[PDB]
Design a protein around this ligand. Sequence first.
Ligand code: GTP
Ligand code: MG
Lengths: 177, 23, 121, 47, 59, 185, 134
Amino acid sequence: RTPEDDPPPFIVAVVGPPGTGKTTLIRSLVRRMTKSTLNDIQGPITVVSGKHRRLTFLECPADDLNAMIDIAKIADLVLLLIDGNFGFEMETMEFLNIAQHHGMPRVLGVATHLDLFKSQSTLRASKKRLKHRFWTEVYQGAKLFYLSGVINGRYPDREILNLSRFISVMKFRPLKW
Amino acid sequence: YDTWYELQKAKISKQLEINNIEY
Amino acid sequence: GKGKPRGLNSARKLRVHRRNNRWAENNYKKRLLGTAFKSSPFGGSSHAKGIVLEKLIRKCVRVQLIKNGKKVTAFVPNDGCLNFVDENDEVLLAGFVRFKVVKVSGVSLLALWKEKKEKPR
Amino acid sequence: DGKRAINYQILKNKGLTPKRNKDNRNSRVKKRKKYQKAQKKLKSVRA
Amino acid sequence: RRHRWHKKILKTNDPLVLSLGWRRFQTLPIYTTTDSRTRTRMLKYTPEHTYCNAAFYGP
Amino acid sequence: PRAPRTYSKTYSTPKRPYESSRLDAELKLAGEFGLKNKKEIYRISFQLSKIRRAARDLLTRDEKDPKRLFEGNALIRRLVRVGVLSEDKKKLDYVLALKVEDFLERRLQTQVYKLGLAKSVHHARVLITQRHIAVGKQIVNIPSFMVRLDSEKHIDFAPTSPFGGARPGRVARRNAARKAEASGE
Amino acid sequence: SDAVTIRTRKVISNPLLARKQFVVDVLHPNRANVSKDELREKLAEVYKAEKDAVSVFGFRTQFGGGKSVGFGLVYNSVAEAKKFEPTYRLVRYGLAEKVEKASRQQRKQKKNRDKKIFGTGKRLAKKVARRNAD
RNA sequence: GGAUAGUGGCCUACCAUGGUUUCAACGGGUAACGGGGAAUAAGGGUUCGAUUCCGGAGAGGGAGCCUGAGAAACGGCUACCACAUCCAAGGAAGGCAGCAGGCGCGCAAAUUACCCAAUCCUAAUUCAGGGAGGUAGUGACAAUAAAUAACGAUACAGGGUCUUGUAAUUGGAAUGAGUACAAUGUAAAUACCUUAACGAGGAACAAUUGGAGGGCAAGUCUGGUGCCAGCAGCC
Ligand SMILES: Nc1nc2c(ncn2[C@@H]2O[C@H](COP(=O)(O)OP(=O)(O)OP(=O)(O)O)[C@@H](O)[C@H]2O)c(=O)[nH]1
Ligand SMILES: [Mg+2]
């Protein structure tokens, strides 16, 4: 039951803990796909990708569970972001359970705050542990993106390019509801 | 056809395209 | 003495006779024609995907296979996990009622019985 | 801090496993006491 | 069921804020088990690791 | 697009695993020699079977065959140098009559226990595992070292490994610090 | 850190590159390791070596500590010690400065961009300037 | 005789009627690249071998050609077939069975990383280039070795004056999984080997996967549930 002439924009909801930096992620995505830096992001924001695709980004209010549940009910792509140095948090687990029970959308993991690690051994081990916990919660083999720094208020260009490239070729599943 | 899943998907598609073409 | 020839220069007769006679063996024929897996309930597969059609005796369910379309009975181990399958569920079945339920909705039944995972709906 | 940290129950994720002894981690100590009970039985029957 | 990561069990005639469909609302469910497919036995608590039926008023 | 490196399996799981006679025989083996699991017994049995196959193939060969002489002398010399065969048992009829207990006796765990200073095979296992053994002057921490016959007399504690002096370990320093900062004043 | 013993075995004189090649092994029973600059200084004072003409480059510490075996070599008249050594070992000893380039992707992309022009390209630059300016 | 680098029905003009086969010619099938090799065996056999080496063929499918010592070359050219990109609608351009990476189902699986330091290759050439190759990252392919504890004192249970088990009992030793100055390592790193310091009583620094009359081992253990025109009647 999807249109063939003019499909609606896919909704990309970004979900994570409060201070982990989702505004910088949507800012960098919009800047890379429009070559135009935008500030003071609030509400859903619509961007066009390719010749047919459009993505409407929406930031999740982190503290509330109510609009969080509504977002998990509505969203078609969910960029779920986790602090790398801290680890998994309760908001991530709650959103994952709500999404799993209400009809699982396409979940894409991203990990931030990875420049706080002072050793490469701890960084690799923590990346492996987070990836395997994500593979427990989501399907196994699911790929997640590792974000290095926030050096100019935004993420490095290569990781943002791969984020944009993965969601510009992906297809979605017909949910029952 | 060849598979029951394929023929049911084809049935869904053919009623969808009849609805589209009468639209 | 015996039926077979025993000449030094009679390898051709023995080889031709063996080649002719191996066709009357069931294993040889069904392994050369590639039709030995139609006697299996799954076909050529080891697991089969199916639709949970009805809840049956008490432990088993009635599940319709998606490939050929015929409906069989399925064994759900750990009888409480009977309630995980609800209606029209996508299951992956293995042989055991000759069948059993292994993977419901992509995840495994042992990851749900031990509460390791939760069912994606 | 106000960050809701992870829990041990939900991180390692070992649910409904039977509670096993401390000696099931290491096979050497378990086989040690198995052989020790065996030789105690042998010493009890060979008197 | 009681969710496997929720620490405490539920209680009969206590408020629960549940989301169903598009709606999110607070109800007063009553948890019942079955008396082996004979009647509806009223459960005062929620079982720790099994499933119980629940009746509640709503849309 | 390179040369493959060779590898082999060192053990073999038995076809008849849980028959009672071999089960309690290997239980006695792993208890008297302090083995961790059953892979030690299977590995020693694999080595014994390889040696038995070599000895059988050599004994089917004729006497004074240079192949038989060369490989038999090499095998007997190797097993004498390891410490399995006795010095008065240099015949192929005697290596066909070997046993796994000879190989299990020769390992570093028993050979440090049998020389004293360990008082049990499991204390010896822990002592080896915790980086204490000095074979010759080289630190060994592998319990299946299979001590050579000529190297049997050089086993002692390390220049490291505080039982051989040289600055006692961490928990002794912890105890000294606690007795100095609390019991001292 | 009581004392270190420096033993140079398998010494072969190589007049082909005008040097001497050997396997060093050091007995350092206590401290931590070899301290390759300090080891280079003492190996320099061993023969008569004028330290900048000494190169020790391969090292591995024996299991259990105390003993470390590596391969090194000593030149003479440090001019051909600069001539015959690899660049990275010269930089490692402080005898050369690390040159700064772009990464391989940037260099290859620059080469492929310069592959698409014929000549110096000043003609094309003036042509596109007068075309897009007016 | 032509053509070929050259032999040759390779082709052409002429002339004969020959050539293969039940010792299987010819046609068909092959989920058939071949070999070195791999597995199971005591031997014979049987099965596998796309794949680290050698040989062959191909570069979406036919066909043709230039250059050059060497190509019927496709990270060379021309045309046809099928796909398919750009636009101002006139025209231009294309070939991942190279390295990454993506699609091919709405049910999934390595990095669009670093470097020529090693091995070699190319050139006018010690110097430049090399996704060839090496380095690190990544789902337990397969394979090797190996931690998760060791020694005691006290009270009961023992075998009974010298030998063991149990304990919300207790005493000090020893050590690495991790963290980390340093040094080594390396093209620069990561890691390994070494090491100043931190790091253990619930060793919480928290080992798993199955099964129990059999077969080829370990329950003549316990409770609960559906039914009975069986006894009693709500135990
Ligand atoms: N070190 C580090 N800091 C980051 C990273 N990403 C974001 N930050 C910082 O974290 C800060 C907080 O994130 P915000 O920009 O406020 O985005 P937010 O998640 O919506 O937080 P709120 O606006 O308060 O809801 C930012 O100002 C960034 O500077 C990262 O990857 N590494
Ligand atoms: Mg923000």
